[PDB]
Amino acid sequence: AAWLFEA
Amino acid sequence: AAWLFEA
Amino acid sequence: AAWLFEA
Amino acid sequence: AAWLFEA
Amino acid sequence: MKEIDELTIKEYGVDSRILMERAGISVVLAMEEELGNLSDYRFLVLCGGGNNGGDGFVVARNLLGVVKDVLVVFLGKKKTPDCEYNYGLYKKFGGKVVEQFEPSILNEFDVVVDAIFGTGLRGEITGEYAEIINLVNKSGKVVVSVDVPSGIDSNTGKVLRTAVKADLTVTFGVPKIGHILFPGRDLTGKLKVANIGHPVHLINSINRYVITREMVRSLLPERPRDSHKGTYGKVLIIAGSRLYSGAPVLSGMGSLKVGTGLVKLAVPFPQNLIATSRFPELISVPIDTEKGFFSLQNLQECLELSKDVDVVAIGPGLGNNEHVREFVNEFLKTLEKPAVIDADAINVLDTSVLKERKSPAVLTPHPGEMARLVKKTVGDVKYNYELAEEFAKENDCVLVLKSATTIVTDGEKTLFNITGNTGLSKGGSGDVLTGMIAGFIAQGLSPLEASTVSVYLHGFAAELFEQDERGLTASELLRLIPEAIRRLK
Amino acid sequence: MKEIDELTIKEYGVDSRILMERAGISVVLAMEEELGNLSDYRFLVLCGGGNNGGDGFVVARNLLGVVKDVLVVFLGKKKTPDCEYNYGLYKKFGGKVVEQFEPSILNEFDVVVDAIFGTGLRGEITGEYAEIINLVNKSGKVVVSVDVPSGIDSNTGKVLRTAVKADLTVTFGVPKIGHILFPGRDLTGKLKVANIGHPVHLINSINRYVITREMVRSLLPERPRDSHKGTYGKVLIIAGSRLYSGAPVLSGMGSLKVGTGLVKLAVPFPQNLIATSRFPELISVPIDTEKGFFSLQNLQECLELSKDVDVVAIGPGLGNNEHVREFVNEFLKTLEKPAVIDADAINVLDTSVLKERKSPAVLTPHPGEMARLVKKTVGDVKYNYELAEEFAKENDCVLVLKSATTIVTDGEKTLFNITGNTGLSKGGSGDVLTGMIAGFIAQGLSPLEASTVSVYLHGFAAELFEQDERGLTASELLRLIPEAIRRLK
Amino acid sequence: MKEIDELTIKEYGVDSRILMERAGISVVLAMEEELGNLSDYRFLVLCGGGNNGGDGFVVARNLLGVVKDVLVVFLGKKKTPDCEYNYGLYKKFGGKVVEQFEPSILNEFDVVVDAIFGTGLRGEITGEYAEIINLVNKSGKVVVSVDVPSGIDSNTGKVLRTAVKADLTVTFGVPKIGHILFPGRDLTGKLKVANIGHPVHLINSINRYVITREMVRSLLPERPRDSHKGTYGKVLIIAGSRLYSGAPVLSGMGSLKVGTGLVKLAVPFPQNLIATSRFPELISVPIDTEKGFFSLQNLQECLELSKDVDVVAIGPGLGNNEHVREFVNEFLKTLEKPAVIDADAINVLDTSVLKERKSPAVLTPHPGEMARLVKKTVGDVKYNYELAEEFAKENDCVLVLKSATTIVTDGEKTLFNITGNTGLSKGGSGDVLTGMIAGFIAQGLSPLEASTVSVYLHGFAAELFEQDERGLTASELLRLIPEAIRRLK
Ligand SMILES: CC(C)(COP(=O)(O)OP(=O)(O)OC[C@H]1O[C@@H](n2cnc3c(N)ncnc32)[C@H](O)[C@@H]1OP(=O)(O)O)[C@H](O)C(=O)NCCC(=O)NCCS
Ligand SMILES: CC(C)(COP(=O)(O)OP(=O)(O)OC[C@H]1O[C@@H](n2cnc3c(N)ncnc32)[C@H](O)[C@@H]1OP(=O)(O)O)[C@H](O)C(=O)NCCC(=O)NCCS
Ligand SMILES: CC(C)(COP(=O)(O)OP(=O)(O)OC[C@H]1O[C@@H](n2cnc3c(N)ncnc32)[C@H](O)[C@@H]1OP(=O)(O)O)[C@H](O)C(=O)NCCC(=O)NCCS
Ligand SMILES: Nc1ncnc2c1ncn2[C@@H]1O[C@H](COP(=O)(O)OP(=O)(O)OP(=O)(O)O)[C@@H](O)[C@H]1O
Ligand SMILES: Nc1ncnc2c1ncn2[C@@H]1O[C@H](COP(=O)(O)OP(=O)(O)OP(=O)(O)O)[C@@H](O)[C@H]1O
Ligand SMILES: Nc1ncnc2c1ncn2[C@@H]1O[C@H](COP(=O)(O)OP(=O)(O)OP(=O)(O)O)[C@@H](O)[C@H]1O
Ligand SMILES: [K+]
Ligand SMILES: [K+]
Ligand SMILES: [K+]
Ligand SMILES: [Mg+2]
Ligand SMILES: [Mg+2]
Ligand SMILES: [Mg+2]
């Protein structure tokens, strides 16, 4: 779930 | 529950 | 819910 | 939920 | 209700100001019930110069200091004394009134309170009143109508050129005819009837009624445990033809699903065999006809079949030609049993027959059939409860005038039914209702009682359908009747 | 509120009859809220000759035709105009009034509506009024009191020889002092305050307040994310002795549990070691004393410890002998920081010191300590909010007079606290509260605000205890404070 | 869409590289949506020399450093400019490219990204491209196709000798015909349509549509509450014969289940009795025939029955012999009502009749019936949307060409339906659809709208069947229509 965004 | 209002 | 009564 | 993809 | 307010004030001695205060606070409490906490909303209150607008000033005043914003637009020229009193209080409490309606004003408010016209509306709305109402209807704001949506004739439910479409209508003492008949029923949205202090005796002196769940539950016949089929009556249904073979079947099961003991159909051979192939619990007597329709040659056999029953239903699917007309009229003149008269039996009926009958009758026309029967237009008869009352009284019958709101009257008592949906706007629906009415009569209800219970339950059963209402058929309606009865108990 | 009714009528122009109608219907709606559907119950309405009894006639009239039975027993001699008007309406609507109370009459009713006396009661109730009220209290019927239970002095909460014990009291506009102070608080049962149409401006001109959840939530200080301990203040607590070694510990954690940054105790050696053995996050400075109690020889050290804090609390467990008295008074005369003064510091206080201080102070006496401080009896000072106001005003302080209802006043604003239970009637409870108040002051609340928030939260924490309240101890109360804060948000 | 890309670049000024980057990242996001976290997987990216392969280089590059392994096999000879640009970026970022496909290479990867050919494929795939695609299809790895599975003709859905079978296809801007028609629909697997930045105006200038839930919900007719059966229209169905007695019944209930008010069947006696024995809410008129089939002797009666309806459906179960042909053609030439023409009425139809009719018509052939009607082979007409468009335009009709993907066209607008399953590949299915279409026309939808809504809902109802689809029958489909309507709302 992290290709686009880091929290 | 009906002193004031009838449905 | 408070127009008529405060608890 | 549809800016990128239509099903 | 004009009578009821006047009497409460003039005879009982309740101050007009007390009635008006109670009306307005009832609107506030009703809005709170529907919206939740009121304190976040901004209220635009539209007040006329009458007592309706007076009620509106009471609403507005009681919101002051408790909600986000209130503004009154006063739209009249003069004010009744009570409206003037409550206007003065609204201003004394710090309230803002403008006398000019500006279209952009709708933008800054969440709820519109419609206190423009109540039961005092006479004549078409034109002018700037019409412009204002049309703007409110295009605004998409939440609309709460005081007493009746402005523009509805409270006596008929007709729109007087234009009317407010309300999400919530709060009316006082009793519902008005205009909330009950369409189009007004549609414009009312959700209806609350508030008790504003009229004596309960005056409220009950009303001669026209809405058919309620409690009324129907009290009329349902008893099922004593030590019973047998004869306890619950016997119905003959004279129905069907070579053209219309399904009608008998729907009428017959209609009677059986409401608890009738024995149901017998008289149907032209071989159409009579259709009934038992579907529901073998029906008795479907073959009638020998010349060309597939009842005629005078079947008179004597139908009279014989009638001797051993409690009620006869006639008309569904009979066809309408001269030979059916001669049969129907001679049978009904000679039959000394209650009759439920529907459909093609209504289309060929000689009303002089009704006057000469000793036994009772129920007539179940839709407005097309009613129009033919009194020689008027559909627009003349539709929702015309005074005409229905006159007809029931003159012909000594119960008249069930079918439509989305059904009218049931014997000429002294008139009841309005509001159960049902558009799934009943489909062939076969009426045929079921005819059977239900005959059935209840056979079980011991008077024609008026049987009619009242049947119209309610027929509509309520439609509402129990689990999928989209437009897909409802009469065969599914039948299946749902016993559920409607269970839920009613 | 006599002012508020008079002004609403005389200045705003609301008819007295409108107020009275709204009062009575509010009682009906309130009963329905508590009882459910009213229609099964039989109501005995007891009406005096005043406006309270007038309100009762309104209640009675509005039940006519809707419930199982209503009867009014009229107990007065004469009727005010509004009572006379509503009596007349009750009779015109078909209502039954008797003028004789017969003990067996209670047998035939389910609910007693007490509309005998309201805020007009003056003097002891004797005579047949007293007999009637005593019969109602022994009847075990459901009792609903109009405005205030009859027999309570609405200004003080005292019982005027005898009073009705109510399950439900419906009062109008605002709560009265008599609902808030005991014994009246106990006799009120569940209290509902109904809006009967007074302008919200008049209702808010009130100078005495009940401390509410919303008030406390709006006063809680902010916790900016980029903070450090100094952001949240620093407290010195001067406390304890060889006799009373626990008090420091409870006061200190009191400050820490409400979010204070740094808490420092000054406690006679070796009692100071008790604190950190229990809560090592406390700083507990050992003070060298001659005989286990603070004296003038510790004055300079305590002043030095005070330079680096925001607030000082003094008194819990100090003991009371002459040397403590000399210390306490000279310290407080010289300390230029806010002070929270409790317990033994109150017992030895010279009130002239308070008058000469430039810095603010909060005093937290129970009524025994208050009695000693003003040289009166406990009965003279208990619940005596006017005396507390006078004392706060004369001494330029905030006074927190502790009891089941706590009074907080600076002489201009007075607030009443009704949170808490009897688990707080146990040693150690007060010591925690002192710490809470100092803590909130250190965080930036004014003495009045800090006091208001602390008394509410201290009581609410007690109510969060999971087992029987009598088993609550101060150590458990401490654990519950952060839960009370969470729930408040 | 070639137009759409060219215009976006040449007229709107979006750089080709921006479109291509957005295409590739959309593939990555789509895979993540279907696979979860990508970081554990090894990706084999197969790139051609065109812009499809360019998109693939973008995919590959964006996986570098984030997933377990990426390898590109470049399979072309030359590269378009954008493919060359993205190849260069892939290498500059550290990516590995080989130019030789080795069968064992599949062993070391989890996901194959198919970026070999897109919409630029012309002609049969032979050679080593074919070998590679066949190896990928036998590999059992997860296959993600860029734009269209390689080997599908994007204009027709035909396989160009061999094609990739994809688990997931990500296409850009709009679906292509090749995703919608079979076999391509089967090879596409799950389809996602990504927005890559074309102006929404260009995307909406498309003249061919996929029938969606939102489109159908917006077309469903309104059910005004004050309605009666006539509000919802009246259908005549001319159907059945001694050979085919069930077809009338399925067509009729088809109309009733979609909310039509009145449905009348004309069916040769005694087959007409079959209908009401099953569904007594139908009117089933007996038609006297010589040998069990309609002929010219029934022309006048069928015209008379048509005067009082809104639409006529004709054809299901009529049989096909010369006398049926003479009847059907003379009836349709004379009928001045909309007609829905199905089954045997299509088999005997003279298309010159359609051209001379003033009133509208809908034709509902399967490809066998279409083939007969235009004198071509089934392979010539199946999925041939341009031929359907031409026929609809030349004959001024709506053509509904039934198959797993149904084509609905009036010659200007063409819609594709993808609801339904193989339970509809069973006798009786078409008969229901004919009734649904007539019904919606009777309710006020245009022939094109009625057709669009009906094909969608007929397929969706099939998908609501609770057990295995192969066991679906037309009688169960009927039961499910109102559920499909409910779910659509
Ligand atoms: C008496 C009663 C029949 C109607 O009186 P009303 O309530 O004052 O009437 P409304 O408020 O609806 O409207 C009255 C005014 O609206 C305006 N109005 C009516 N028809 C209009 C029209 N077609 N075009 C423009 N304005 C119109 C008129 O100004 C009318 O009086 P007017 O012609 O002298 O100007 C009614 O029963 C009533 O008085 N009260 C209703 C119950 C209630 O509100 N309870 C509280 C206690 S009063
Ligand atoms: C004016 C106000 C201060 C008191 O007036 P009131 O409400 O009429 O007073 P009550 O009803 O409590 O009782 C008044 C009467 O009770 C009786 N009463 C009072 N003390 C009594 C005693 N100790 N022994 C016996 N009877 C007594 C008296 O008869 C007194 O008047 P009286 O001495 O002339 O006989 C009060 O604020 C008020 O008028 N209304 C309260 C709010 C309200 O009810 N709202 C509605 C609108 S009025
Ligand atoms: C222009 C467009 C119609 C086709 O161009 P394309 O995308 O480069 O075409 P593809 O990638 O599918 O394939 C093109 C090449 O595949 C190869 N190819 C085509 N048919 C073949 C065959 N039957 N056998 C072997 N190779 C073949 C060819 O090499 C062809 O060009 P060539 O004959 O000169 O060698 C297309 O609309 C397009 O350019 N882009 C699609 C949308 C997109 O990807 N968006 C991003 C922005 S470009
Ligand atoms: N929109 C609606 N809302 C509520 N009830 C309705 C609606 N439309 C029709 N009905 C009810 O359905 C029944 C219709 O019977 P009616 O005889 O009027 O029509 P029908 O088509 O002739 O039925 P049948 O074919 O059995 O004679 C009536 O009870 C009517 O009140
Ligand atoms: N019944 C009660 N209901 C609510 N609050 C109460 C009750 N009894 C006591 N309290 C509260 O508990 C606290 C008692 O503190 P106080 O100083 O008056 O008694 P204490 O025994 O001296 O406690 P400490 O030993 O800590 O000094 C006060 O806040 C008081 O208001
Ligand atoms: N595999 C499938 N997927 C989706 N829809 C299908 C499938 N097979 C058939 N259908 C649909 O079912 C219906 C078949 O009707 P058609 O008239 O073509 O066949 P039929 O056997 O003649 O039915 P009938 O006997 O009623 O005439 C059409 O709507 C068609 O689109
Ligand atoms: K109104
Ligand atoms: K009282
Ligand atoms: K591809
Ligand atoms: Mg009918
Ligand atoms: Mg203390
Ligand atoms: Mg077919």
Q: Which amino acid is at F385?
A: Y
| Of G310, G313, G289, the residue nearest G301 (C-alpha) | G289
Going from the Cα of F416 to the center of ligand 11, the distance in angstroms, rounded, reads 19
Q: Which amino acid is at F114?
A: D
Q: How far apart are CA F221 and CA F244, in angstroms?
A: 32
Whether E143 and E114 have beta carbons less than 8 Å apart is answered as yes
And the tokens for E41? 């909303």
Task: Give the CA dihedral G315, G316, G318, G322, nearest 10 degrees.
Answer: 40
Whether G66 and G40 have beta carbons less than 8 Å apart is answered as no
- C-alpha distances (whole Å) from F464 to each of E174, F427, F457, G259, G397 are 48, 19, 10, 59, 77
CB contact under 8 Å between E246 and G273, yes or no, is: no
CATH 3.40.50.10260 maps onto chain F at 1-206
Whether G24 and G55 have beta carbons less than 8 Å apart is answered as yes
Nearest-Cα distance to chain D for G15, in Å, is 19
3-state secondary structure of G4: helix
Q: How far apart are CA B4 and CA E194, in angstroms?
A: 5
CB contact under 8 Å between B3 and F32, yes or no, is: yes
CA atoms within 13 Å, Cβ hemisphere of F428: 16
And the tokens for F260? 């204070």
DSSP-assigned letter for residue E242: S
| Among protein residues, the one whose CA lies closest to atom 26 of ligand 5 | F428
Q: How far apart are CA G110 and CA G126, in angstroms?
A: 26
Query: Exposure pattern of E372-399 as b/e (b: 16+ CB <10 Å)?
Result: bbeeeeeeebbbbbebbbebbeebebbb
Q: How far apart are CA E155 and CA F304, in angstroms?
A: 88
Going from the Cα of E448 to the center of ligand 8, the distance in angstroms, rounded, reads 50
Mutation target for G interface from E416, E426, E434, E476: give the one with most G CBs within 10 A: E426
Does E195 touch chain B if contact means CB atoms closer than 8 Å? Answer: yes
- C-alpha distances (whole Å) from F86 to each of F43, F57, F146 are 17, 6, 15
Task: Give the CA dihedral E222, E225, E229, E230, nearest 10 degrees.
Answer: -70
Closest chain G CA to residue A5: G29
* Residue F68: CB atoms within 10 Å: 13
**Cis amide prior to G270 (ω within 30 degrees):** yes
**Residue pointed to by tokens 């004869």:** E230
After which residues, if any, is chain A broken (C to N > 2.5 Å)? none
| Among protein residues, the one whose CA lies closest to atom 18 of ligand 6 | G366
Q: Which amino acid is at G400?
A: V
CB contact under 8 Å between D7 and G30, yes or no, is: no
Q: How far apart are CA G31 and CA G72, in angstroms?
A: 17
Going from the Cα of E110 to the center of ligand 11, the distance in angstroms, rounded, reads 53
Across-strand partners of F115? F47
DSSP-assigned letter for residue G403: S
Nearest-Cα distance to chain E for F272, in Å, is 53
Does an interface of 3+ CB pairs under 8 Å exist between D and E?
A: no
DSSP G230-248: GGG-EEEEE---SS--SHH
Distance of CA G212 to the CA centre of its chain: 11
Q: How far apart are CA E268 and CA E261, in angstroms?
A: 23
- C-alpha distances (whole Å) from G290 to each of A6, E413, G296, G349 are 81, 57, 11, 22
| Of G77, G8, G82, G11, the residue nearest G51 (C-alpha) | G82
- CATH architecture designation of domain E207-489: 3-Layer(aba) Sandwich (3.40)
Strand G190-194 relative to strand D5-6: parallel, antiparallel, unpaired? antiparallel
Question: Which stretches of chain B sit within 8 Å of chain F by CB?
Answer: 1-4
Closest chain C CA to residue E34: C1
- List, in order, residues 6 or more apart from G138 with CB less than 8 Å away: none
Across-strand partners of G264? G236, G283
DSSP E162-204: -----SEEEEESS--HHHHSTTHHHHH-EEEEE--S--HHHHT
Going from the Cα of F161 to the center of ligand 2, the distance in angstroms, rounded, reads 17
Q: Which residues surround ligand 7, an ion (CB under 5 A)?
A: E 114, 145-146, 150
Residues in chain C: 7
With a 6 Å cutoff on the Cβ, whether F334 touches ligand 5 is: no
And the tokens for E171? 């009316």
Q: How far apart are CA G250 and CA G239, in angstroms?
A: 10
Across-strand partners of G409? G399, G414
H/E element holding G284? Answer: strand G283-287
Q: How far apart are CA G401 and CA G387, in angstroms?
A: 10
Whether F348 and F373 have beta carbons less than 8 Å apart is answered as no
Q: How far apart are CA E168 and CA E155, in angstroms?
A: 19
CA atoms within 13 Å, Cβ hemisphere of G382: 11
DSSP-assigned letter for residue G114: E
DSSP-assigned letter for residue F173: S
CA atoms within 13 Å, Cβ hemisphere of G78: 2
Q: From G3, G46, G84, G117, give the residue whose CB has the most ligand 3 atoms within 8 Å, as the site to mutate.
A: G117
Q: How far apart are CA G131 and CA G150, in angstroms?
A: 13
Q: Which residues of F touch E93 (CB under 8 A)?
A: 12, 199
3-state secondary structure of F147: coil
**Residue pointed to by tokens 């900016």:** F224
**Residue pointed to by tokens 């800090």:** F450
Q: Which residues of E touch B1 (CB under 8 A)?
A: none
Residues in chain B: 7
Q: Which residues of F touch C4 (CB under 8 A)?
A: 26, 29, 194-195
| Of E272, E268, E442, E259, the residue nearest E362 (C-alpha) | E442
**Residue pointed to by tokens 């005067």:** G307
Going from the Cα of F16 to the center of ligand 5, the distance in angstroms, rounded, reads 44
Mutation target for C interface from E22, E27, E32: give the one with most C CBs within 10 A: E32
Instruction: Identify each DSSP E strand in E259-378 by its residue range.
Output: 262-268, 283-287, 311-314, 339-341, 361-363
| Of G307, G304, G318, G255, the residue nearest G283 (C-alpha) | G255
Q: Which amino acid is at E54?
A: G
The C-alpha angle G231, G233, G235, rounded to 5 degrees, equals: 165
Q: Which residues of A touch G33 (CB under 8 A)?
A: none
Q: Which residues surround ligand 10, an ion (CB under 5 A)?
A: E 343, 430
Q: What method was applied to determine this entry?
A: X-ray
Q: Which class is E1-206 in CATH?
A: alpha beta
Q: At residue E117, what are phi and psi to the nearest 5 degrees? A: -125, 145
**Residue pointed to by tokens 């009443």:** F416
| Of E366, E316, E307, the residue nearest E340 (C-alpha) | E316
3-state secondary structure of E356: helix
Q: How far apart are CA E420 and CA E403, in angstroms?
A: 10
And the tokens for E443? 């079980």
Q: How far apart are CA E305 and CA E55, in angstroms?
A: 62
Q: How far apart are CA G264 and CA E275, in angstroms?
A: 19
F426 is in an annotated binding site: yes
Q: How far apart are CA E32 and CA F353, in angstroms?
A: 55
Whether G340 and G364 have beta carbons less than 8 Å apart is answered as yes
Interface E-G: count of C-beta contacts within 8 A: 116
Across-strand partners of G263? G235
- List, in order, residues 6 or more apart from G65 with CB less than 8 Å away: G94
Dihedral over Cα of F126, F128, F132, F134: its sign: positive
Q: How far apart are CA G489 and CA G478, in angstroms?
A: 18
H/E element holding E114? Answer: strand E111-115
